[PDB]
CSV table of C-alpha atoms and ligand atoms in Angstrom, one decimal:
chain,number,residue,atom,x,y,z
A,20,UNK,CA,90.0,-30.5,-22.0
A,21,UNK,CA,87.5,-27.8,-21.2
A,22,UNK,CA,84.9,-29.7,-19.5
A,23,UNK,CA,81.5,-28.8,-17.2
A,24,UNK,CA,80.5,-31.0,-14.7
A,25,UNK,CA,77.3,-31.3,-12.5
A,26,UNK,CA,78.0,-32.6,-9.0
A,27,UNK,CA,74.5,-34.2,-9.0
A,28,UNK,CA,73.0,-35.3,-12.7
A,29,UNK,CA,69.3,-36.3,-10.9
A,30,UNK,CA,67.1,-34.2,-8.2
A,31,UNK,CA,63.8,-34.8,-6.4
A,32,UNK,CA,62.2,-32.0,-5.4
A,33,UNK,CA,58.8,-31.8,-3.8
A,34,UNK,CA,56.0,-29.3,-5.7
A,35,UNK,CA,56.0,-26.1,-4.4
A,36,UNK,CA,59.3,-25.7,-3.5
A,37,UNK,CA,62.9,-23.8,-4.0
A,38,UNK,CA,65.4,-25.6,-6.4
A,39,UNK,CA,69.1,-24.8,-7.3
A,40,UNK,CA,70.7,-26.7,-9.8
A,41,UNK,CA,74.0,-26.7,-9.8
A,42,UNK,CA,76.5,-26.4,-12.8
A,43,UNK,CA,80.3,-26.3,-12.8
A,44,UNK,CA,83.6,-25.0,-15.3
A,45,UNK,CA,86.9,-24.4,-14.3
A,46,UNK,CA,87.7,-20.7,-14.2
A,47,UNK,CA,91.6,-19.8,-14.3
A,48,UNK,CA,92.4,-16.8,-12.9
A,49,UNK,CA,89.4,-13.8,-12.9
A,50,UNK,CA,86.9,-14.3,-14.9
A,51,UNK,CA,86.0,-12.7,-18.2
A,52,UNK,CA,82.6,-11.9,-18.7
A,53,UNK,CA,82.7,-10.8,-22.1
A,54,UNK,CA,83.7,-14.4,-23.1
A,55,UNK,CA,81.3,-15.9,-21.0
A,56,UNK,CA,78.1,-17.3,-21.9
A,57,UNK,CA,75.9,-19.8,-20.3
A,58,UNK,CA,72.1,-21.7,-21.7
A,59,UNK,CA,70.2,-22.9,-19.4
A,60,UNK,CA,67.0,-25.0,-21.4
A,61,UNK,CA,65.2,-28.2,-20.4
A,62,UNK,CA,63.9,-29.8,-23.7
A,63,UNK,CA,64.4,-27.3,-25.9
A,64,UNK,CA,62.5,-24.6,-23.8
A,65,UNK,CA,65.4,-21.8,-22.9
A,66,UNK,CA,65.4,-20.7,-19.4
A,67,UNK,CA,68.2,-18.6,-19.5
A,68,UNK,CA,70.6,-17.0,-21.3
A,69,UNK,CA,74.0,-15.8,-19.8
A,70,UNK,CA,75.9,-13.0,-22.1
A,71,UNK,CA,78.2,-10.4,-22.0
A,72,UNK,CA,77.8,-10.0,-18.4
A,73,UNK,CA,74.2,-9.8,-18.1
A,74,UNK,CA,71.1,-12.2,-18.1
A,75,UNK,CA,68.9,-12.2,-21.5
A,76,UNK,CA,65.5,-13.4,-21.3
A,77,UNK,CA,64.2,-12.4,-24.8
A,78,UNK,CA,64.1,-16.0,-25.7
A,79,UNK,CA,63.1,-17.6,-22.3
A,80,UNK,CA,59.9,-20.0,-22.6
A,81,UNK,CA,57.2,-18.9,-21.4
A,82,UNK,CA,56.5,-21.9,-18.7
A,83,UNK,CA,59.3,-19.7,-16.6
A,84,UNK,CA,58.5,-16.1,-16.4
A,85,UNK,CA,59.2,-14.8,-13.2
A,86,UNK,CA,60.7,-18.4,-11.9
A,87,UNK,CA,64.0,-18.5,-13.1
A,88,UNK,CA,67.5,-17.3,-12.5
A,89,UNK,CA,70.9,-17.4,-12.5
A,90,UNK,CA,73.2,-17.1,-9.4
A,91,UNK,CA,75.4,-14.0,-11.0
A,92,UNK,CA,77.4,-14.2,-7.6
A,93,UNK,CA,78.9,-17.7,-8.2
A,94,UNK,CA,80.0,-17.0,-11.6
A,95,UNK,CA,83.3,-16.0,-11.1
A,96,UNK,CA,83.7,-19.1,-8.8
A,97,UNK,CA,82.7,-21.3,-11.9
A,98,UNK,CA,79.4,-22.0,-10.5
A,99,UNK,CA,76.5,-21.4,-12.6
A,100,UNK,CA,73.5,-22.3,-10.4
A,101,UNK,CA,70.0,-22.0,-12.1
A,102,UNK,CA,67.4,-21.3,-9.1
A,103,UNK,CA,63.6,-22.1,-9.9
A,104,UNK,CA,61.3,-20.7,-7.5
A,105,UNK,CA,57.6,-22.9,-6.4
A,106,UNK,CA,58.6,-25.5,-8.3
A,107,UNK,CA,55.9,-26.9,-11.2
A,108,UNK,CA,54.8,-30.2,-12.4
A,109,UNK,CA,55.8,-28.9,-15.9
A,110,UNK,CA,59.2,-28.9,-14.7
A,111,UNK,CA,60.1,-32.3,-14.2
A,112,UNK,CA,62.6,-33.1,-17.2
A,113,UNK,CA,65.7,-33.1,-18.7
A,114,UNK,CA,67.4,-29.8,-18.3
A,115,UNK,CA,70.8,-29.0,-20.3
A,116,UNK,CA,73.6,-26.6,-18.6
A,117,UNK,CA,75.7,-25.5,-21.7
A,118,UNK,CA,78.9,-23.4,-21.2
A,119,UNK,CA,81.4,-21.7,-23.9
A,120,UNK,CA,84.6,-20.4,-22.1
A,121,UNK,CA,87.7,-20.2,-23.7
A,122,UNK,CA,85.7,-23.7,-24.7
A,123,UNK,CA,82.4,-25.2,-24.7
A,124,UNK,CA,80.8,-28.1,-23.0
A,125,UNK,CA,77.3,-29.0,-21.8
A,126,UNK,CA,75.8,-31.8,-19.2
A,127,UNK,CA,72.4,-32.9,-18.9
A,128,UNK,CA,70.0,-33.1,-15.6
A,129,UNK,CA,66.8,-35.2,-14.6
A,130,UNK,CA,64.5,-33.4,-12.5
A,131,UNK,CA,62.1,-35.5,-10.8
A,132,UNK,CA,58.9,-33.6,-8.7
A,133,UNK,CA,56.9,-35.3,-6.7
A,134,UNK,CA,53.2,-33.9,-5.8
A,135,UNK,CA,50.3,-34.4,-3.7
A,136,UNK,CA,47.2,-36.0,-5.5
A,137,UNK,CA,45.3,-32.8,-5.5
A,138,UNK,CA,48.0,-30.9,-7.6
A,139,UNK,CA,48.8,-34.0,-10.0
A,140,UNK,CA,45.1,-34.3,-10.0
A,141,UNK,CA,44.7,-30.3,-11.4
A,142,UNK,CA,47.7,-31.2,-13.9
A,143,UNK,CA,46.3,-34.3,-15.2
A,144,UNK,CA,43.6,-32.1,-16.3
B,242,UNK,CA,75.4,-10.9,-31.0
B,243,UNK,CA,76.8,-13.5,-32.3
B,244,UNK,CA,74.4,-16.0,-33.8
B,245,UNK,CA,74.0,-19.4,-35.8
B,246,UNK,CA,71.6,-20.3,-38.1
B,247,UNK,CA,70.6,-22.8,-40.8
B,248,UNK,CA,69.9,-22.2,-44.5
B,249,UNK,CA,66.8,-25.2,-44.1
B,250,UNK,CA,65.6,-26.5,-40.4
B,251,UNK,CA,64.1,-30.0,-42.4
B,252,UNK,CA,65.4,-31.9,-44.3
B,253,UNK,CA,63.7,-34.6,-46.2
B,254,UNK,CA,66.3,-37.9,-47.4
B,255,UNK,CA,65.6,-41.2,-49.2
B,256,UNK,CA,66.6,-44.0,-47.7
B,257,UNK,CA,70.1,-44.7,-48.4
B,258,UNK,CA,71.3,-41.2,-50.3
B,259,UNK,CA,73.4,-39.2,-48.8
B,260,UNK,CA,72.8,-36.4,-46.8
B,261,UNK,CA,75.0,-32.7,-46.2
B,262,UNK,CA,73.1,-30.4,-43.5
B,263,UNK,CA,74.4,-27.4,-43.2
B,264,UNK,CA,74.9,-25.1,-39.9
B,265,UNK,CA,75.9,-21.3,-40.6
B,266,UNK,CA,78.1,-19.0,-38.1
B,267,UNK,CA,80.0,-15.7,-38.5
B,268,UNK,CA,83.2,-15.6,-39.6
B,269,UNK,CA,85.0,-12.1,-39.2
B,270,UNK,CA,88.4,-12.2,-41.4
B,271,UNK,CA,89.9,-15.8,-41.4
B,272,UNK,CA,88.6,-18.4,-39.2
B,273,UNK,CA,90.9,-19.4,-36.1
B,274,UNK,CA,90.8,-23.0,-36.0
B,275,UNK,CA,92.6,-22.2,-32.4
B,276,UNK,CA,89.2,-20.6,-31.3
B,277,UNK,CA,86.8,-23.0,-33.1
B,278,UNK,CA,84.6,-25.4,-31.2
B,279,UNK,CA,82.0,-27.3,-33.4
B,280,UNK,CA,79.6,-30.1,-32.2
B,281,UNK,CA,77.0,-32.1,-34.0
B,282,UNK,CA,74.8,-34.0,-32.4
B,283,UNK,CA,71.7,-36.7,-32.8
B,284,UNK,CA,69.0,-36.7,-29.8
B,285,UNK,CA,71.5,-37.2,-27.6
B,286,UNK,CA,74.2,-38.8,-29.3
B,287,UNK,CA,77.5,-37.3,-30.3
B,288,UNK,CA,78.2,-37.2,-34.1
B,289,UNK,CA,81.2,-34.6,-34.5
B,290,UNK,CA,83.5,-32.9,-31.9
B,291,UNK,CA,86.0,-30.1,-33.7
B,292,UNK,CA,87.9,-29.0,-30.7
B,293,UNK,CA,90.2,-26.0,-32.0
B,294,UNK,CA,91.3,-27.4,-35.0
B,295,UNK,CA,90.7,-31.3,-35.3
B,296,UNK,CA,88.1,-34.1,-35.6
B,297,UNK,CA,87.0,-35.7,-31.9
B,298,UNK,CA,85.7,-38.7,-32.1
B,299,UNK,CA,86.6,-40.8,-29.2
B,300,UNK,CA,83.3,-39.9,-28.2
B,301,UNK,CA,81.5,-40.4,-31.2
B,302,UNK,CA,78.6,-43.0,-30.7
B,303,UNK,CA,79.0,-46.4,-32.9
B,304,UNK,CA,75.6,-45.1,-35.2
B,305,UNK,CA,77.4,-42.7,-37.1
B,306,UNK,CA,81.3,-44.7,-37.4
B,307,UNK,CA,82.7,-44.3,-40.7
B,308,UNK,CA,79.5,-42.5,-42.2
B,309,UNK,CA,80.0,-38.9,-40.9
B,310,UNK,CA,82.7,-36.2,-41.8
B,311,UNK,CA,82.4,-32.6,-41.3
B,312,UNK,CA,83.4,-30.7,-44.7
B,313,UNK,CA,86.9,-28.7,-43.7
B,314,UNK,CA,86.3,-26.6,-46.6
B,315,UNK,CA,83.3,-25.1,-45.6
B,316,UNK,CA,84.3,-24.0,-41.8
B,317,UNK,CA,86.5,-21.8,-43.2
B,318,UNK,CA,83.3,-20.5,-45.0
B,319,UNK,CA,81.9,-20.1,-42.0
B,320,UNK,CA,79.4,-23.1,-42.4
B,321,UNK,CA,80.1,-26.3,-40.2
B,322,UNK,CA,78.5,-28.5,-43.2
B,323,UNK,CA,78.1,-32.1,-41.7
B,324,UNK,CA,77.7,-35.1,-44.3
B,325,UNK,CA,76.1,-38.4,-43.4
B,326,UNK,CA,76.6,-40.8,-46.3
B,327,UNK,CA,73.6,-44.0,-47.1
B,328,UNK,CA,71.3,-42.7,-45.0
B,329,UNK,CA,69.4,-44.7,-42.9
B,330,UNK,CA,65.9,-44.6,-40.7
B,331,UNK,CA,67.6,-44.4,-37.7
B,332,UNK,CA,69.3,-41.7,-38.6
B,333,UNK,CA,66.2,-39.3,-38.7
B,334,UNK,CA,65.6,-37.0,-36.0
B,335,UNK,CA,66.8,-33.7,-34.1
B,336,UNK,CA,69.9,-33.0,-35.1
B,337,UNK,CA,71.9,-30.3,-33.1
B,338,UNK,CA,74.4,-28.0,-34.5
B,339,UNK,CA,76.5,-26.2,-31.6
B,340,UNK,CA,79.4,-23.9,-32.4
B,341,UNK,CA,81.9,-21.4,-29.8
B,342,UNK,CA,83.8,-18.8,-32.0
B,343,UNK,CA,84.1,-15.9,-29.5
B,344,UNK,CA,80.5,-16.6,-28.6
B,345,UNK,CA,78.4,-19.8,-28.8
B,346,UNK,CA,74.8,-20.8,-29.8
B,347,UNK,CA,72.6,-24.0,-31.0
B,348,UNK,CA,70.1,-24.7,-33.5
B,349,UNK,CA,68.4,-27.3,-34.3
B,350,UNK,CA,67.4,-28.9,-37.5
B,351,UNK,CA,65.0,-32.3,-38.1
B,352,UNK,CA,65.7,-34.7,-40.1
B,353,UNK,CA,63.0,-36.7,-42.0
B,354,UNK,CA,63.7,-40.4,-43.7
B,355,UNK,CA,61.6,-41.6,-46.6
B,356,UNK,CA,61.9,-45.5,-47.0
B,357,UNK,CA,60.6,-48.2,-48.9
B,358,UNK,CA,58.7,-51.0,-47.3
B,359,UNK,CA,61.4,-53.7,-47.4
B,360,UNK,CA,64.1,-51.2,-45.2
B,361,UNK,CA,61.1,-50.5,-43.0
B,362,UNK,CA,60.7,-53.8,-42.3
B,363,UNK,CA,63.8,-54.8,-41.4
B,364,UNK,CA,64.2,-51.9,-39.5
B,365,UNK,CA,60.9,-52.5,-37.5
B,366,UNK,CA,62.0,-56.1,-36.6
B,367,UNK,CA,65.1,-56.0,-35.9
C,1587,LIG,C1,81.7,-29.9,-27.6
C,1587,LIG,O1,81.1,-28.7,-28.0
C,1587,LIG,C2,80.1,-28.2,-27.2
C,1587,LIG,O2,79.8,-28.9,-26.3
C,1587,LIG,C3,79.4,-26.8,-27.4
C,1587,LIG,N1,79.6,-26.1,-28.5
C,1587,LIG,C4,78.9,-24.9,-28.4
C,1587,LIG,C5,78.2,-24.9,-27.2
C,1587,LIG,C6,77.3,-23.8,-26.7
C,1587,LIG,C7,76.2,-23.4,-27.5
C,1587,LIG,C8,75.4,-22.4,-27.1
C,1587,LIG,C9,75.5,-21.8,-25.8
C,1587,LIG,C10,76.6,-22.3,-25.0
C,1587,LIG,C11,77.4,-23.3,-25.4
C,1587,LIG,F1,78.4,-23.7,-24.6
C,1587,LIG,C12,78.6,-26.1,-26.6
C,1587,LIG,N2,78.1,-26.6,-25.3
């Protein structure tokens, strides 16, 4: 059946940094936007929303202005990689990659982040 | 664009009564069970998979065996109406309905579960 998969279901990544998270779906022959739509959220806080071609962000949480995005290039490849730039301590979690294309599927993904004392310490608080 | 919503986002049950929550989607002329993709889910926990035209549940977590249908009537309403019978305090929760018909979207809807003190009970030491 129509099914996305995630080559990796858990990253680490280290505060501060650059993350793609990868997110796969078969894709026929060329692709067709206008039946394509992708949700990126991680606990019920939308990070992105692939439709019709284009990226909406009228919905995204706040916790990911300006930090989010999604890889348009790698779309027709059946890649939808969500990129987080200087990665948070609010972002550890479970994110969801949900995909309708000619059928719909969806896979979860822990992040882990580790920090230095100083940043946890500014968290914590 | 195309969009689903829900008549009531809580619901409030009594402890063994039965429960139908219902999960609202356009529907143009006739629906096309062919294009159709409905799923209901429970924190994580598969309920209902309608997969162009029939119930999957070869996925559907042992919770909810024998106590959930999805009303057949009421897709071709438009509304993917999900009916839990004897409700129980596991049961409550987020509950998600997600539905593809020539576009796709989720919404969520929590579920609340009154109970007299003996059910509590049992439920708290089992
Ligand atoms: C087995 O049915 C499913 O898994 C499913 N149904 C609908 C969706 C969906 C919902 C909003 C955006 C994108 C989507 F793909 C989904 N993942």
């Amino acid at each position: 059946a129509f099914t996305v998969t995630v080559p990796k279901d858990l990253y680490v990544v280290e505060y501060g940094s650059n993350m793609t998270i990868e997110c796969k779906f078969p894709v026929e022959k060329q692709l067709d936007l206008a039946a394509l739509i992708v949700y990126w959220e991680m606990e019920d806080k939308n990070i992105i929303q692939f439709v019709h071609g284009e990226e909406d962000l009228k919905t995204q949480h706040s916790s990911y202005r300006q930090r989010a995005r999604l890889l348009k290039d790698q779309l027709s490849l059946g890649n939808a990689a969500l990129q987080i730039t200087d990665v948070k301590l609010q972002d550890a979690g479970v994110y969801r990659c949900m995909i309708s294309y000619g059928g719909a599927d969806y896979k979860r993904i822990t992040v882990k982040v580790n920090a230095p004392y100083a940043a946890a310490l500014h968290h914590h608080h």
